[PDB]
Amino acid sequence: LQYGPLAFVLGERTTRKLTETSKVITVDGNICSGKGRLAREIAEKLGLRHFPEAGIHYADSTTGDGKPLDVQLSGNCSLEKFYDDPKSNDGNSYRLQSWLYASRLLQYADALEHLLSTGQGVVLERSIYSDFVFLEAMYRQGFIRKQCVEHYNEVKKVTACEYLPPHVVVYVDVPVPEIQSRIQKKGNPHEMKITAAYLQDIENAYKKTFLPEMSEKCEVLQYSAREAEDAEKVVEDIEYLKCDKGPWPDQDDRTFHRLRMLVQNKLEVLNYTTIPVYLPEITIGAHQSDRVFQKFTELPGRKYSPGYNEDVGDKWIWLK
Template identity: 90%
Template sequence: MERSIYSDFVFVEAMYNQGYIRKQCVNHYNEVKKVTVREYLPPHVVVYIDVPVPELQRRIQQKGNPHEMKVSSAYLQDIENAYKKTFLPEMSEKCEVLQYSAREAEDAEKVVEDIEYLRYDKGPWLDQDDRTFHHLRMLVQNKLEVLNYTTIPVYLPEITIGAHQSNRVFRKFLELPGRRYSPGYNADVGDKWIWLK
């Protein structure tokens, strides 16, 4: 579970600690999370693979992505701290948690075996029935309803855009090749026989 509604707060905390976002942004995130997370069920199991920050930085340098190479060790350390001090204790109350070092996680058969031997005897999954599962499925397959949970009218420059900026982005989008008209009606991308359609 690299990024989800249950674990993404670690990035928010790290960004705030490093001064990338303001406290108002953190408060907005917490408000949205409070409204949305109660509608969903946590995972049955969390597998946490602990890779030390120096090893992460070595892998990032090896990968060579210029944007990732700019990530500071302090930011990565804040993410690790949030996972270990907040995320894992919270999740251990709601679901099964397995923790491995990077070396231990390389043994995939052992990890699978550990998952198979879990009892899965805690969390809200035990209280569900067909009706509640149906309600959850109907919710998650309706993208507009899911989006409604996150629509809280607050302007924060770090995470929202204003009307004028939104209009500029939309106008630029329409200038892209093939975006001015419906698919099949854009001569600029080679659509033919437009007048016969």
């Protein structure tokens, strides 16, 4: 039985599967920080489920086969081109920003669905609550316009208000010269073109806005570059927290039922991402839309429902 009103009237309640160790955690940091490894260590030590940071092709991994699709069919944006030409006149910067925000929203919905269906906790490498800093980094450097900022703000206001903030916010603080040195030592040619002002803007928006905002409703555990390697210390710091300030203690069975109905039905989650606001950077013409949609339909397992595609090995179709 798929979860719904019928499964709620009889039997299934979610407050009987929350076991005080759920503690939705998002690990946060500037570019080229050890936040990913720290998140993985925290997840494998606390017994939670780790979510790798949502990229351009995150949605492709959760639908059909996990293999990513073409950039023209999903995303229509690349990070390498943003690093090469951040001021390109085709609108790649804000298109990438909006696609990344939608991917993060989808990942947050999936994490919340897993948490409310199994009771197991989740660890995230970023969230929709901290994506905006990158947006600000594009605005202060002149990469995007003010109308793009307004559209982002409208979408965030109509989307993120329906979910619960994470219990614990973990921040890995690494100074700008150190992350610049790490980028130099990394080896990716495209990342070498990141100016210091971009990272400084990210850090400024991160310290001045994100952390103060999440302080009033989440447990914020700031760290340093040297404190990140010893993940056992971070884990035992998490085990001795008091999650008493957020809206989580004020959640009943009915609110949890509404949230669980919302986190599934990913179409409902993504509804307000495609509002009819005609920004030139993200608006697509009728001919291009039709061509790309027809190309997407021609994919091996995308013409029909996930159980009615004969050309991927689905048998007994006529009896379903």
